[PDB]
Amino acid sequence: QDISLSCGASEPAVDQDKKKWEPDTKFLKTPNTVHAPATYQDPSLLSTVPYMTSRIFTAPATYEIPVKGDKRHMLRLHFYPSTYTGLNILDSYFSVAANDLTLLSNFSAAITCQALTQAYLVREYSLAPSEKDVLSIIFTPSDKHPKAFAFINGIEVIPMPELFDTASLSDTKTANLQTMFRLNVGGQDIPGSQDSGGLTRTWYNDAPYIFSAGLGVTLQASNNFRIDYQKMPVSTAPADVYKTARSQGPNGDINMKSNLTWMFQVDTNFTYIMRLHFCEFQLAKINQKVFNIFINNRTAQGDTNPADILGWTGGKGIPTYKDYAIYVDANTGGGGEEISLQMTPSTFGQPEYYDSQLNGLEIFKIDTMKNLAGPNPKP
Ligand SMILES: *[C@@H]1O[C@H](CO)[C@@H](O[C@@H]2O[C@H](CO)[C@@H](O[C@@H]3O[C@H](CO)[C@@H](O)[C@H](O)[C@@H]3O)[C@H](O)[C@H]2NC(C)=O)[C@H](O)[C@H]1NC(C)=O
Ligand SMILES: *[C@@H]1O[C@H](CO)[C@@H](O[C@@H]2O[C@H](CO)[C@@H](O)[C@H](O)[C@H]2NC(C)=O)[C@H](O)[C@H]1NC(C)=O
Ligand SMILES: *[C@@H]1O[C@H](CO)[C@@H](O)[C@H](O)[C@H]1NC(C)=O
Ligand SMILES: *[C@@H]1O[C@H](CO)[C@@H](O)[C@H](O)[C@H]1NC(C)=O
Ligand SMILES: [Ca+2]
Ligand SMILES: [Ca+2]
């Protein structure tokens, strides 16, 4: 079952999306640590749980959470940078490790939230099977900052399926991942209560990430259309991801003159998995919608093997996804902190229409040298 801990809470509670949270107390091994309420409630909080209570650590502190050693787990860390016991939140710098994996280092939640124009954030990780029955989560105030403290508002550990296998360049089954982005392309926001697999992932509409002048056209499956998952685990992504899409639209000439373009800020010197979710719910035949996919200006799917969703799936309403790996560094145009995803029709093989489509997108950072931490953004 899920372990969803509100750090510093004094009693169990439920949030706005029906998620049950328990106090952290029984899992925190380090004694005599401060628990404190936030003394300001940002209007953008969707709930006071778990955000209005925190732990404050002025020395290292360790949680020990029981887990099954053979299972992958999602780990979520919830941060609400605000005022706690009168401390300056800008003085908080710390690291977080999950066993031997560094998740965060020199982390400033305040600077990160300021750069995002957010009041709180969640950092989500997928941890490979550990072969240990305890997950140790260690918070370490920065020893480079005399005034540093660590803080944490909530910690979740959720067992999850082995949803990762390989990526078009690589094996990702044993990778430890950070979730960078999770989008329901062309569709509505999906709260965790509506996610598949009991995974309580949030899927966000993709419009804020579109950087082409043309926003394309959004598509929705017919009423009572059924997604026919077949061998794809339903936990991969919920049906509303596949029942909605962004396409370029009905005007093939406009489409051939543009790329549909999404842009994402990420950390340099990592490889990322771009998981593109697809489901054709309008067309019925191969070679009707055939498109090129570019990632950071390089062909991910194109030339003589362009993307054709029905080519991949064999049928209307059958979902799929394709994983593409991209290494991001400064030996690149535009500074090494971005991923661009672009689509445009292919002229290869004389398709019936000239269009492109995407139904969902997830971007995951792969661990390097047992680290996933990047720098704080510019404020
Ligand atoms: C911990 O994180 C903080 C906050 O991200 C780091 O401080 C920031 O460090 C960056 C460099 O990565 C500073 O930017 C640089 O500033 C100088 C002077 O203006 C400029 O010459 C550079 O071109 C660059 O822009 C940034 O200003 C700085 N922020 C603050 C508030 O000082 C810090 O270095 C990290 N590590 C440690 C151990 O403190
Ligand atoms: C769609 O996007 C692709 C990928 O960014 C464009 O092709 C690139 O164009 C840039 C800038 O001229 C070049 O640096 C890359 O070498 C090109 N990549 C490839 C694989 O050709 C493509 O021309 C764009 N199409 C439209 C219609 O804008
Ligand atoms: C990225 O890698 C380069 C080359 O090793 C290094 O010089 C640079 O400091 C790295 N940047 C970050 C943010 O780690
Ligand atoms: C991709 O091409 C565009 C258009 O020429 C350019 O502005 C951008 O810097 C290029 N990006 C990369 C990552 O090379
Ligand atoms: Ca809390
Ligand atoms: Ca969708």
Numbering used by the authors: 28 to 196, 204 to 413
Paper text:
Members of the plant-specific Catharanthus roseus receptor kinase 1-like (CrRLK1L) family are key players in monitoring the cell-wall status and regulating cell expansion. CrRLK1L family members localize to the plasma membrane and are composed of a cytoplasmic kinase domain, a single transmembrane helix and a variable ligand-binding ectodomain. Loss of FER function impairs pollen-tube reception, whereas ANX1/2, together with BUPS1/2, helps to maintain pollen-tube integrity during polarized tip growth, assuring fertilization.
We determined the structure of ANX1 via single isomorphous replacement using a platinum derivative. ANX2 crystallized in space group C2, and the structure was solved by molecular replacement using the ANX1 structure as a search model. The structures of ANX1 and ANX2 were refined to 1.48 and 1.1 Å resolution, respectively, with residues 26–411 in ANX1 and 28–411 in ANX2 being well defined in electron density. The ectodomains of ANX1 and ANX2 superimpose with an r.m.s.d. of ∼0.6 Å, comparing 375 corresponding Cα atoms in their ectodomains. In our hands, the ANX2 receptor crystallized in a different crystal form and diffracted to 1.1 Å resolution. Comparison of the ANX2 structures resulted in an r.m.s.d. value of 0.5 Å over 377 corresponding Cα atoms. We located three and four well defined N-glycans in our high-resolution ANX1 and ANX2 structures, respectively. The glycosyl­ation pattern is conserved among ANX1 and ANX2, which harbours an additional site located at Asn331. Taken together, while the ANX1/2 malectin-like domains share extensive structural homology with both animal and bacterial carbohydrate-binding modules, the surface areas normally used to mediate the interaction with carbohydrate ligands appear not to be present in ANX1/2. Taken together, our structural analysis of the ANX1 and ANX2 fertilization receptors reveal a new tandem arrangement of two malectin-like domains which may have lost their ability to bind carbohydrates in a similar way to previously reported CBM binding surfaces and which form a new potential ligand-binding site located at the interface of the mal-N and mal-C domains.
